[PDB]
Amino acid sequence: SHMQLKFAECLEKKVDMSKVNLEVIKPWITKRVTEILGFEDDVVIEFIFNQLEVKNPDSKMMQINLTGFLNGKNAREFMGELWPLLLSAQENIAGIPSAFLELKKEEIKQR
């Protein structure tokens, strides 16, 4: 643990990457984390990516790790937006959240 702190409750909704696609959240998370500060991180991204690379990520560690870079409040809001994103994704078939199903947008990404 890099930095201990408090998290949200919705983070206790658990998830299942084996059911939902995390890759579809890579740009969402990467964009979120990037937008959170304004620049493309890596340590925070890796944390989510590495964590989202499992079948059962620890939102606690996610928010805890995020808080290590974020302001702390953004971590709670971020997790309460991505954690739920998977919740809906895990409810899909392709493991995609309605955020992408309904809405739609290009995929921006740079080095």
Curated annotation (Swiss-Prot):
Post-translationally, this protein is described as follows, namely: Phosphorylated on multiple serine and threonine residues by DYRK3 during the G2-to-M transition, after the nuclear-envelope breakdown. Phosphorylation by DYRK3 promotes disassembly of nuclear speckles. Citrullinated by PADI4.
Which family is it part of?
Belongs to the splicing factor SR family.
Q: What does this protein do?
A: Part of pre- and post-splicing multiprotein mRNP complexes. As a component of the minor spliceosome, involved in the splicing of U12-type introns in pre-mRNAs. Involved in numerous pre-mRNA processing events. Promotes constitutive and exonic splicing enhancer (ESE)-dependent splicing activation by bridging together sequence-specific (SR family proteins, SFRS4, SFRS5 and TRA2B/SFRS10) and basal snRNP (SNRP70 and SNRPA1) factors of the spliceosome. Stimulates mRNA 3'-end cleavage independently of the formation of an exon junction complex.
User: What interactions and quaternary structure are annotated?
Assistant: Identified in the spliceosome C complex. Found in a pre-mRNA splicing complex with SFRS4, SFRS5, SNRP70, SNRPA1, SRRM1 and SRRM2. Found in a pre-mRNA exonic splicing enhancer (ESE) complex with SNRP70, SNRPA1, SRRM1 and TRA2B/SFRS10. Component of the minor spliceosome, which splices U12-type introns. Found in a mRNA splicing-dependent exon junction complex (EJC) with DEK, PRPF8, NCBP1, RBM8A, RNPS1, SRRM1 and ALYREF/THOC4. Interacts with DDX39B, CPSF1, RBM8A, RNPS1, and ALYREF/THOC4. Seems to be a compound of RNA export complexes that are released from speckles in a ATP-dependent manner.
Entry protein name? Serine/arginine repetitive matrix protein 1
Region entry Necessary for mRNA 3'-end cleavage and cytoplasmic accumulation: which residue ranges?
4-111
Note the position of the cross-link Glycyl lysine isopeptide (Lys-Gly) (interchain with G-Cter in SUMO2).
K104
Tell me the compartments it is located in: Nucleus matrix; Nucleus speckle
